[PDB]
Amino acid sequence: ICLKKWPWWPWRRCK
């Protein structure tokens, strides 16, 4: 699954 947790995450690159 993709990173979709932690409302304060620096990186991402999901959907």
Side-chain angles (χ1 to χ4, degrees):
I1 142 79
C2 173
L3 182 285
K4 233 218 118 215
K5 63 234 301 163
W6 310 334
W8 56 279
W9 195 236
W11 320 302
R12 46 141 127 71
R13 321 218 89 219
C14 207
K15 178 269 230 214

